[PDB]
């Protein structure tokens, strides 16, 4: 039969902020959003930091946000999980780590990794935990092979990390630097194996040599070359030749993992996480499998669903919404609308929002949809320009589309949840009027277009799918630890 639709409408990069200064959200003329906001129940929810599985303080983002929305739970990221296992001790009881330690004592340990607190590919505090573990289980020879960042952190900051780590070597008693390589060598990913080789060699074959890590790095600086581009080198008398790789992101660790792996005998080789490097390694950390995301629950209650967005947020309403899964669920269909081909979207702030809107109206007119997941990309994609007037026009175009969409849903006696996945356009200028081109940490609005209900006064993205299921009168599975924003 024909169905009354329930729609989640994600205004990407659109959050609540008090001041109007650099606040495209407030300066925009958005009569439709404002009409719905004044008429219908509203609240505001957290989309950053620990509430979306990120470290405390970290702005949210589209990938994390769409995964938390779809999952109906906090989806904990790798960095957050590792940090928690250290704070809670699990790390030190880790079988693959205690195995590794036992193996070098029976043959009586190198450590590879990006040495910074960038948190994109690694974190050196995890190195500090490896050391401490080895100091508990009494390891004698620990050699640290350092890859220098300058890319996820300040361009010239390696000396700070090296100094803190040797202090740890001293405050702890074991460990030393055998080799030092800019990530431009040890963490290439564009199949540039001339660069990988220099790093392989430093780790003790033909390669530059210096008396300390500090010395080689300072030599690089004097030659105009910062941390990322540091030519690999050995630390004098400190590298006795040849293992744990504490990077947790595969794409930049794989090529070096393949050179090293692809002649030594009886080598224990572990990676913090499984890389696509084609070799047999012990894996320190296993992923959480996400099941019973909203798409799966819709499918298992025989509901039809639509995922729709233009190119820039199409992965987000498909792969990320479905919990890291490309395959459609049974009953699921999708509409991809091509984004404009421009280098930056301030050149066409309406992007393809009107074509997204028209495609949605086409699908709603079929009358066969239980569940709709729609994203309007514009506030985030234009707000990354740090330009106020383009981002205003982006929000105004979305607001006009939003009115046609929500009015049709309401005329089909359906329901909409209007929200966002994190902030951006709520601050496109700094307080000194410079461009502000990142996401924000601000909480996101929520409108539920059902009269006579009351919403909880706070929440998080993990609560949105429970709310949808509430409106659908569908049972919520245990895997979804979030809670519906509608009070009962």
């Amino acid at each position: 039969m024909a169905k009354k639709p329930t729609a989640l409408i994600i205004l990407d990069g659109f959050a609540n902020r008090e001041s109007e200064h650099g606040n495209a959200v407030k300066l925009a003329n958005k009569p439709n959003f404002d009409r719905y906001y004044n008429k219908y129940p509203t609240t505001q929810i957290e989309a950053s930091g620990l509430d979306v599985g990120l470290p405390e303080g970290q702005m949210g983002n589209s990938e994390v946000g769409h995964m938390n929305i779809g999952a109906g739970r906090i989806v904990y990221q790798s960095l957050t999980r590792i940090n928690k296992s250290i704070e809670d001790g699990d790390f030190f009881e880790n079988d693959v780590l205690n195995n590794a330690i036992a193996h070098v004592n029976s043959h009586d340990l190198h450590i590879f990794g990006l040495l910074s607190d960038g948190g994109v590919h690694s974190h050196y505090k995890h190195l500090f935990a490896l050391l401490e573990l080895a100091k508990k289980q009494g390891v004698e020879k620990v050699y640290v092979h350092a890859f220098l960042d300058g890319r996820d952190v300040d361009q010239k900051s390696a000396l700070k990390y090296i100094e803190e780590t040797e202090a740890k070597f001293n405050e702890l008693g074991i460990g030393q630097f055998a080799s030092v390589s800019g990530r431009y060598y040890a963490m290439d990913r564009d199949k540039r194996w001339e660069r990988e080789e220099k790093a392989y060699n430093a780790i003790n074959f033909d390669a530059p040599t210096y008396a300390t890590a500090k010395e080689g790095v300072e030599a690089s600086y004097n030659e105009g070359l910062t941390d990322e581009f540091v030519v690999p080198f050995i630390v004098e008398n400190q590298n006795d030749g040849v293992v744990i790789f504490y990077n947790f992101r595969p794409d930049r660790a794989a090529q070096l993992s393949e050179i090293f792996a692809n002649q030594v005998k009886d080598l224990f080789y572990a990676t913090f996480t499984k890389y696509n490097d084609n070799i047999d390694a012990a894996i320190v950390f296993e992923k959480v499998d996400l099941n019973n995301t909203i798409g799966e629950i819709a499918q298992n209650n025989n509901l039809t669903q639509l995922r729709i967005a233009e190119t820039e947020k199409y992965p987000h309403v498909t792969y990320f919404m479905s919990g890291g899964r490309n395959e459609e669920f049974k009953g699921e269909r999708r509409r991809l609308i091509d984004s404009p081909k421009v280098a930056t979207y301030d050149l066409k702030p309406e992007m393809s929002a009107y074509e997204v809107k028209d495609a949605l109206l086409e699908e709603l007119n079929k009358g066969d949809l239980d569940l709709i997941i729609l994203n309007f990309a514009n506030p985030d994609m234009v707000g990354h320009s740090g330009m106020l007037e383009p981002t205003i026009k982006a929000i105004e175009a979305v607001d006009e589309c939003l009115g046609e969409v929500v009015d049709k849903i309401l005329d089909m006696d359906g329901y909409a949840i209007i929200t966002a996945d994190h902030g951006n356009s709520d601050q496109v200028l700094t307080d000194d009027d410079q461009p502000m081109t990142t996401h924000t940490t601000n909480p996101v609005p929520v409108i539920v277009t059902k009269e006579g209900v009351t919403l909880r006064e706070t929440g998080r993205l993990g609560d949105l799918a429970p709310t949808l299921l509430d409106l659908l009168n569908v049972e919520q599975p245990e895997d979804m630890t979030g809670e519906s924003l509608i009070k009962h």
Partner: peptide
């Protein structure tokens, strides 16, 4: 995005 995977900073280095 594509170069990486969901559990390895898909918002960065793209």
């Amino acid at each position: 995005x594509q170069v990486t995977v969901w559990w390895a900073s898909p918002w960065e280095d793209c």
